[PDB]
Design an enzyme around this catalytic site. Sequence first.
Site, PDB file in Angstrom:
ATOM      1  CG  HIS A  68      48.651  42.955  41.393  1.00  0.00           C
ATOM      2  ND1 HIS A  68      47.373  43.070  42.196  1.00  0.00           N
ATOM      3  CD2 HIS A  68      48.424  43.065  40.517  1.00  0.00           C
ATOM      4  CE1 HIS A  68      46.534  43.793  41.687  1.00  0.00           C
ATOM      5  NE2 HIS A  68      47.026  43.790  40.262  1.00  0.00           N
ATOM      6  CG  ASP A 107      50.987  43.161  37.146  1.00  0.00           C
ATOM      7  OD1 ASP A 107      51.082  44.420  37.296  1.00  0.00           O
ATOM      8  OD2 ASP A 107      49.792  42.269  37.568  1.00  0.00           O
ATOM      9  CD  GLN A 269      34.066  40.964  41.495  1.00  0.00           C
ATOM     10  OE1 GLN A 269      34.434  39.797  40.164  1.00  0.00           O
ATOM     11  NE2 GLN A 269      34.652  41.785  41.448  1.00  0.00           N
TER      12      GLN A 269
HETATM   13  O1  LIG Z   1      37.167  42.513  40.922  1.00  0.00           O
HETATM   14  C1  LIG Z   1      37.742  43.360  40.083  1.00  0.00           C
HETATM   15  N1  LIG Z   1      37.494  44.557  39.803  1.00  0.00           N
HETATM   16  C2  LIG Z   1      36.589  46.417  40.135  1.00  0.00           C
HETATM   17  C3  LIG Z   1      35.798  45.391  41.660  1.00  0.00           C
HETATM   18  C4  LIG Z   1      34.705  46.467  41.807  1.00  0.00           C
HETATM   19  C5  LIG Z   1      33.746  46.869  42.856  1.00  0.00           C
HETATM   20  C6  LIG Z   1      33.255  47.654  42.832  1.00  0.00           C
HETATM   21  C7  LIG Z   1      32.030  48.334  43.857  1.00  0.00           C
HETATM   22  C8  LIG Z   1      32.667  47.298  45.150  1.00  0.00           C
HETATM   23  C9  LIG Z   1      33.166  45.861  44.889  1.00  0.00           C
HETATM   24  N2  LIG Z   1      34.356  45.962  44.232  1.00  0.00           N
HETATM   25  N3  LIG Z   1      35.298  47.258  40.633  1.00  0.00           N
HETATM   26  N4  LIG Z   1      36.000  47.170  39.114  1.00  0.00           N
HETATM   27  C10 LIG Z   1      35.776  47.825  38.304  1.00  0.00           C
HETATM   28  C11 LIG Z   1      37.575  48.608  38.984  1.00  0.00           C
HETATM   29  O2  LIG Z   1      38.686  47.868  38.930  1.00  0.00           O
HETATM   30  C12 LIG Z   1      38.755  43.414  39.913  1.00  0.00           C
HETATM   31  N5  LIG Z   1      40.005  44.139  39.015  1.00  0.00           N
HETATM   32  C13 LIG Z   1      41.023  44.487  38.922  1.00  0.00           C
HETATM   33  C14 LIG Z   1      42.179  45.132  37.514  1.00  0.00           C
HETATM   34  C15 LIG Z   1      42.536  46.260  38.439  1.00  0.00           C
HETATM   35  C16 LIG Z   1      41.888  46.789  38.207  1.00  0.00           C
HETATM   36  C17 LIG Z   1      41.174  42.711  38.193  1.00  0.00           C
HETATM   37  C18 LIG Z   1      40.320  41.711  38.625  1.00  0.00           C
HETATM   38  C19 LIG Z   1      39.194  42.085  39.088  1.00  0.00           C
HETATM   39  N6  LIG Z   1      38.413  40.790  39.558  1.00  0.00           N
HETATM   40  C20 LIG Z   1      38.485  39.510  39.665  1.00  0.00           C
HETATM   41  C21 LIG Z   1      37.516  38.490  40.283  1.00  0.00           C
HETATM   42  N7  LIG Z   1      38.206  37.004  40.213  1.00  0.00           N
HETATM   43  C22 LIG Z   1      38.745  37.186  39.927  1.00  0.00           C
HETATM   44  N8  LIG Z   1      40.243  37.698  39.885  1.00  0.00           N
HETATM   45  C23 LIG Z   1      39.894  38.822  39.986  1.00  0.00           C
HETATM   46 MG   LIG Z   2      49.160  45.454  36.461  1.00  0.00          MG
HETATM   47 ZN   LIG Z   3      48.988  41.471  36.436  1.00  0.00          ZN
END
Ligand SMILES: O=C(Nc1cc(-c2ccccn2)nn1CCO)c1nc(C2CC2)ccc1Nc1cncnc1
Ligand SMILES: [Mg+2]
Ligand SMILES: [Zn+2]
Length: 313
Positions: A68, A107, A269
């Site tokens: 961020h 942000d 993912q």
């Molecule tokens: O990956 C992201 N989120 C995630 C991981 C898992 C998860 C759940 C279980 C185990 C491992 N991981 N659940 N969730 C859903 C909720 O955020 C993610 N989130 C966000 C914003 C905060 C929301 C922004 C980018 C993200 N990814 C990303 C991938 N590539 C390059 N840039 C970014």
């Molecule tokens: Mg934000």
């Molecule tokens: Zn952002």
Amino acid sequence: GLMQFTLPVRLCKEIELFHFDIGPFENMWPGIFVYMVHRSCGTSCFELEKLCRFIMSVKKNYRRVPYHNWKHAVTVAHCMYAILQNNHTLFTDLERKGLLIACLCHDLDHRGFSNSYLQKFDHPLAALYSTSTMEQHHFSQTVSILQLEGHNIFSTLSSSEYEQVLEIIRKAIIATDLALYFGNRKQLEEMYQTGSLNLNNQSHRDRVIGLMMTACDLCSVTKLWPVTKLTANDIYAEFWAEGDEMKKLGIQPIPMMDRDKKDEVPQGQLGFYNAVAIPCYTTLTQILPPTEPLLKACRDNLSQWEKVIRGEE
Ligand SMILES: O=C(Nc1cc(-c2ccccn2)nn1CCO)c1nc(C2CC2)ccc1Nc1cncnc1
Ligand SMILES: [Mg+2]
Ligand SMILES: [Zn+2]
């Protein structure tokens, strides 16, 4: 006035494409932003001197966190640029002004912690802003910088235009709260499918700009696989530090934030792509067909994570 920004040939061509990576040269990022403002808004939109001073104060108020950070701000601004440039005639003059600035500022002063962690820490910002805690703070920081002497890039706007642009920016920044995304997309899905979506209806425009802000904010999942893969390391670096801080409060973090559960990341993912990213770019492509390349790139990255699980990499 006659002073254009001009990028090297490879950047000049590739900056137009959705999957453009702004690169590792931090000192080129301000120039890349001004270039995008000049092409997307016009050379007359902002006084160059005030815009440069605004940009550099915004940069200073982004922290040295793994994800961020300043690079994220300019990355999210570039995705908005590509959307606006591929949808020339759909957006007003005040929207093109507001939305690039909204993205750069969305942000501001992020500490690498979620709204949940602020609430559980009992941070002063969680008493100030009960929901969308960091997003209300990001908007607050944007207004503060606009009010620094020589930083008011909207100084040429009438009183009512100025209020409209700051309202576009507030709603756009609040919309980056992923908690608000789920309901916004479901409403846009129902409106699109029942045929009730109307871009002359301001409350409808607001929803569509909200979805655009989510699409730009998540745009690291729409890059070429090596960019997406390495950016994923940066986001999990924040998640794992938040999990460490949860453990210090005597709270077992969710698996997403637990560095002892790295094995669960590929499947996490998949969930994120199926539950958040693919639905986002799917609804955006229905409303704004020229944004189809973001959906295609996202699907390609989902397929790469499926390959990681099947041990093909
Ligand atoms: O990956 C992201 N989120 C995630 C991981 C898992 C998860 C759940 C279980 C185990 C491992 N991981 N659940 N969730 C859903 C909720 O955020 C993610 N989130 C966000 C914003 C905060 C929301 C922004 C980018 C993200 N990814 C990303 C991938 N590539 C390059 N840039 C970014
Ligand atoms: Mg934000
Ligand atoms: Zn952002």
